[PDB]
Amino acid sequence: ELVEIIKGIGIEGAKEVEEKVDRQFYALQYLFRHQDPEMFIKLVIANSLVSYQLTGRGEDWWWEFARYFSGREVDSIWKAYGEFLPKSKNNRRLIEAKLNRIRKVEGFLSTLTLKDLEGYYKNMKMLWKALIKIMGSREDSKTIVFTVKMFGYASRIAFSRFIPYPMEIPIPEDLRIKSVTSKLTQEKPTKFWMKIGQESGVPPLHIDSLIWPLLGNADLTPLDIELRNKLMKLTELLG
**Helical (H) or strand (E) element with 151:** helix 142-158
Q: Which of residues 52-71 bind Cl ion (CB under 5 A)?
A: 57-58, 60
**Residues contacting residue 83 through CB under 8 Å, at least 6 positions apart:** none
Q: Which of residues 175-194 bind Cl ion (CB under 5 A)?
A: none
Active site (annotated) includes residue 224:
no
Of the candidate residues 1, 71, 73, 115, the single one contacting Cl ion (CB under 5 A): 115
Q: State in angstroms the smallest separation of the CB of 39 from Cl ion.
A: 12
Stretch that binds Cl ion, among 66-74, 111-119, 135-143, 185-193 (CB under 5 A): 111-119
Closest CA to 49 of 202, 186, 172: 172
Q: CA of 192: how far to CAs of 111, 142, 171, in Å?
A: 36, 15, 9
Is 24 known as a binding-site position? yes
- Alpha-helix runs per DSSP H in the chain: 2-20, 23-32, 37-49, 58-69, 77-87, 95-109, 114-122, 124-135, 142-158, 175-182, 189-200, 204-211, 225-238
Closer residue to Cl ion (CB): 60 or 168: 60
Q: Does 114 bind Cl ion (CB under 5 A)?
A: yes
CA distance 59 to 43: 16
Stretch that binds Cl ion, among 65-73, 95-103, 189-197, 204-212 (CB under 5 A): 95-103
Q: Does 224 bind Cl ion (CB under 5 A)?
A: no
Q: Which of residues 126-165 bind Cl ion (CB under 5 A)?
A: 157
C-beta nearest to Cl ion: residue: 10
Q: CA of 91: how far to CAs of 12, 48, 53, 153, in Å?
A: 32, 12, 8, 21
Q: Does 123 bind Cl ion (CB under 5 A)?
A: no
Catalytic residue among 22, 98, 140, 142: 142
Instruction: Characterise 163 by phi-psi region: left (phi > 0), alpha (psi -120 to 50), beta (else).
Output: beta
Closer residue to Cl ion (CB): 187 or 219: 219
Q: Does 12 bind Cl ion (CB under 5 A)?
A: yes
Size of the site for Cl ion (CB under 5 A): 17
In the complex, the residues that contact Cl ion under the rule CB under 5 A are 10-12, 29, 51, 57-58, 60, 89, 94-97, 113-115, 157
Active site residues: 142, 174
